[PDB]
């Protein structure tokens, strides 16, 4: 991460033994559960790319998904190189216009990542940009690992409505379907995949029943 | 480690009871898993060689690997002595041009390691250099301890593709094969060592299938 010192200067403070570890656990216990993405962002808020890398590295399992993340990171970095104009060379006094190897956190050091981040000319959030590219790779993994699909999440005869619903909304998040299509699934596929007796209870309510209405109505059905 | 005080001076702050211990555990629970190397680096970021030693020392088991690390540390130190010119003797006022016994953390004290580290003439990262030599010894141990080899990591008839892959990519890291050879193994040995039915699914995709493509395609095969 970064901390400030007398005179307006900035320095590299280290990442902590309880955050690297909590990330390792969130990735393992939850097995790239959708929540891994905000669990990562929060644990890395105020961090630099060097530590974001070390956190992801310390994880020693699910190394198939860590590679999917690495392929996604290299792709987003190749776009930053493609869109940026790589202007005329700058003097040694000045630091290299940050490139994709630099933000991804490989070619560059940690003191140059901070420099850009708190550079007066153009403070650049190298830490936030690399982290965003990762949320994409992590999100792809959540979906790649999703145990089921929302279409196949259906109420079991003795399964309760709320439990069936918990699975349905969780999958809707992880599958990361477009928001407009999420509204269609919630209002249609959920009356459709539910047991018939509970389905009739929701149908008895009328049209566009709110979830509070549906969850209350099929309570005990 | 090191902390600064009024007047621009530096002092030896101690290492903490939760870092020595977490390193001890990362080395034991993971049994020199590849992740031990970044787990060590992060736990030791801002540290001095004296503590890097005490951490490694506190570990009381896997003492065969701690000796491999010690042989690697003495070898890297003998190269620093071999390459450096041991210039003409300096006055008592000045501190000894750091040598290998000094960086390895034996002959020298902790106040002389910090002095060099924050020496105005040439701040020297004695802490980082010794730590790097160790990552080499730790990396050799990861490989010496690696339970299997990537060539023998093959999909079992009922084993799923992703689990076989997790082992393959993990071994690729620990065996630390050259990056060009890692690309060949990932694109060839993995269609080769996989079950035939799943192998045909990857072959049906075409040539150079990405992992997201392969991992998605053989899902349920």
């Amino acid at each position: 991460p970064v901390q400030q010192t007398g005179g307006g200067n900035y320095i590299h403070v280290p990442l902590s033994p309880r955050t690297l570890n909590a990330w390792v656990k969130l990735v393992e216990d939850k097995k790239f559960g959708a929540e891994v993405v905000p669990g990562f962002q929060a644990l890395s808020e105020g961090c630099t790319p060097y530590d974001i890398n070390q956190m992801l590295n310390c994880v020693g399992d699910h190394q198939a998904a860590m590679q999917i993340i690495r392929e996604i990171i290299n792709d987003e970095a190749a776009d930053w190189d493609a869109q940026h104009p790589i202007p005329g060379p700058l003097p040694a006094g000045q630091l290299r216009d940050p490139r994709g190897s630099d933000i991804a956190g490989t070619t560059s050091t940690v003191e140059e990542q901070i420099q850009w981040m708190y550079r007066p000319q153009n403070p650049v959030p190298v830490g936030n940009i690399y982290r965003r590219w990762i949320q994409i790779g992590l999100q792809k993994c959540v979906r790649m690992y999703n145990p089921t699909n929302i279409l196949d999440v259906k109420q079991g005869p003795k399964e309760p409505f709320q439990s069936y619903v918990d699975r349905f909304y969780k999958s809707l998040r992880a599958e990361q379907t477009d928001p407009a299509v999420k509204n269609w699934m919630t209002q249609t596929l959920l009356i459709q995949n539910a047991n018939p007796d509970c389905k009739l209870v929701l149908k008895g309510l009328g049209m566009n029943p709110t979830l509070e209405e549906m969850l209350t109505a099929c309570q005990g059905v | 480690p090191v902390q600064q005080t009024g007047g621009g001076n530096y002092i030896h702050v101690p290492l903490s009871p939760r870092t020595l211990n977490a390193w001890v555990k990362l080395v034991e629970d993971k049994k020199f898993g590849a992740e031990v190397v970044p787990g060590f680096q992060a736990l030791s970021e801002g540290c001095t060689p004296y503590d890097i030693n005490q951490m490694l020392n506190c570990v009381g088991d896997h003492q065969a690997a701690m000796q491999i690390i010690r042989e690697i540390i003495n070898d890297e130190a003998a190269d620093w002595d071999a390459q450096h010119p041991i210039p003409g003797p300096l006055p008592a006022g000045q501190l000894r041009d750091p040598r290998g016994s000094d960086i390895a953390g034996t002959t020298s004290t902790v106040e002389e390691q910090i002095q060099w580290m924050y020496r105005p003439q040439n701040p020297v990262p004695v802490g980082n250099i010794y730590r790097r030599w160790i990552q080499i010894g730790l990396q050799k141990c990861v490989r010496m301890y690696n339970p299997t080899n990537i060539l023998d990591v093959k999909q079992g008839p009922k084993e799923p593709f992703q689990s076989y892959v997790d082992r393959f990519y993990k071994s690729l890291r620990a065996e630390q094969t050259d990056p060009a050879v890692k690309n060949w193994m990932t694109q060839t040995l993995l269609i080769q060592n996989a079950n035939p039915d799943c192998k045909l699914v990857l072959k049906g995709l075409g040539m150079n299938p990405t992992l997201e493509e392969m991992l998605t395609a053989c899902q349920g095969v």
């Binding site: 070390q54 992801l56 590295n57 190394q63 991804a104 | 992740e35 970044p38 890291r173």
Partner: peptide, 8 residues
């Protein structure tokens, strides 16, 4: 190479 998939 190394046991560092990400970074240097």
């Amino acid at each position: 190479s190394g046991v560092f998939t990400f970074g240097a």
